């Protein structure tokens, strides 16, 4: 966190300050104040120990805070999350007996460097030539997050087994959470008792939903979803599942069952799926030639995907063109000349309080000093009708 600094331990600063203070104390008898002079060995020897000790002395407050967060709260340390996907095992022919794809069945891509393992045993019933099961990455890290139809090779040639694929893109593969999200999660645990605010409801619902979900809580909103008619004793929840889509009714029911023993007796809880607004971007920018046009394109792509992450977005809040331009420019090596959002350069208001943005198309027009204008169109949604 942001613990205030107790003392100075910059190695060089300690040497210089030691020479200056020795001159001050001696009353001018000590005149060797050169930081690189003949007194450098003595002052440097002292400053080595001084720095290595004061560095640890400066950690007292943060150590106390972390001890509080670790012992009394007992928050778990996130080593990293392995990416998980949903495989699909097809057989060669319709068998007369049940077929089993064993647990820990290794699958990979064409390269063979990315390897997943089945979560459990997969039982394809007799007559069916088909089954589906979840799989987990071999190791943690964000490089196991792969797109759909990317895992197709299985190393062990099991009999009667014809093919394997993944119907979902592998997601939620991480190499460790951030400090700020850890702090926020610690604080919410301190305050979640008896959900009473929009925040409490939103954090509780998306805590029970999973990592990568979104909640929006609105008070006094009936099933007609009309703000001008407020009904006291009503809480409306809008959900976006872990996959980033509006919530499956099964997820709706699960969240409702989880939150039922926690709502105030007599009040009414309403839960409905969220809405998504498609954002179409057009960028005209000037590059400094420090990167190739493809490098700038993919850098801006990842920057926007981080920016338009539902975890980074607040439902119902407008998308500001200045914020998007800052996010794009933060990539570096370019100058933004013009940005259009949905055929306009103005801020976009969301249709209602529960609509989250999702950006789908980005049009690149990147000129450079030489004069080569790189123009490109990129769709980001999974549109099969492109």
């Amino acid at each position: 966190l942001n613990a205030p600094q107790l003392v100075v331990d910059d190695y060089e600063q300690l040497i210089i300050d030691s020479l200056v203070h020795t001159n001050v104390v001696s009353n001018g008898e000590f005149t060797d104040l050169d930081a690189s002079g003949f007194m450098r060995p003595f002052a440097g020897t002292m400053a080595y120990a001084g720095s290595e000790l004061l560095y640890k002395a400066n950690l007292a407050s943060i150590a106390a805070a972390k001890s509080f967060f670790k012992n009394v709260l007992g928050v778990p340390e996130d080593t990293g999350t392995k990416a998980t996907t949903t495989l699909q095992f097809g057989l060669s022919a319709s068998l007369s007996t049940d077929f089993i794809v064993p647990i820990n069945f290794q699958v990979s891509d064409l390269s063979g460097t990315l390897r997943f393992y089945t979560i459990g045993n997969l039982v394809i019933p007799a007559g069916a030539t088909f089954g589906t099961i979840e799989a987990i990455a071999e190791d943690i890290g964000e490089k196991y997050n792969v797109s759909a139809n990317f895992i197709d090779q299985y190393s062990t040639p099991l009999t009667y087994l014809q093919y394997v694929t993944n119907i979902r893109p592998a997601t939620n593969g991480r190499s460790g959470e951030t400090i700020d999200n850890l702090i926020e999660r610690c604080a919410q645990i301190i305050r979640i008792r008896n959900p009473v605010s929009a925040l409490d409801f939103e954090q509780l619902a998306e805590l029970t939903m999973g990592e990568g979900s979104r909640c929006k809580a609105i008070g006094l909103l009936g099933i007609n979803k009309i703000v001008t008619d407020p009904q006291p004793g009503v809480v409306h929840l809008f959900l976006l599942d872990v996959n980033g889509n509006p919530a499956d009714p099964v997820t709706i029911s699960t969240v409702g069952a989880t939150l039922q023993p926690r709502i105030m007796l007599g009040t009414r809880l309403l839960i409905s799926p969220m809405e998504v607004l498609n954002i179409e971007l057009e960028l005209i920018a000037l590059s400094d030639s420090s990167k190739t046009f493809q490098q700038l394109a993919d850098d801006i792509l990842e920057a926007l995907k981080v920016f338009f992450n539902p975890a980074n977005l607040t439902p119902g809040e407008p998308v500001l063109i200045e914020e998007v331009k800052f996010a794009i420019r933060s990539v570096g090596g370019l100058s933004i000349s013009y940005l259009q959002m949905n055929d306009n350069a103005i801020n976009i208001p969301m249709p209602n309080q529960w609509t989250i943005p999702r950006f789908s198309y980005i049009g690149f027009e990147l000129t450079d000093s030489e004069g080569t204008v790189y123009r490109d169109n990129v769709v980001t949604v999974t549109n099969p009708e492109e």
Binding site: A93, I124, A128
Partner: protein
Amino acid sequence: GFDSSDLTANGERFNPEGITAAHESLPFGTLVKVTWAVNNKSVVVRINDR
């Protein structure tokens, strides 16, 4: 009543927009060319349901 909630005899969710067909006696995965005599147009379907 055949929607994406029904399960084919193959074991996959019925896709109404898919190029598939149900045959009474063919093994699943068999590729059948179906030619419509009106326009002499042929499409290959995969037998998955029964």
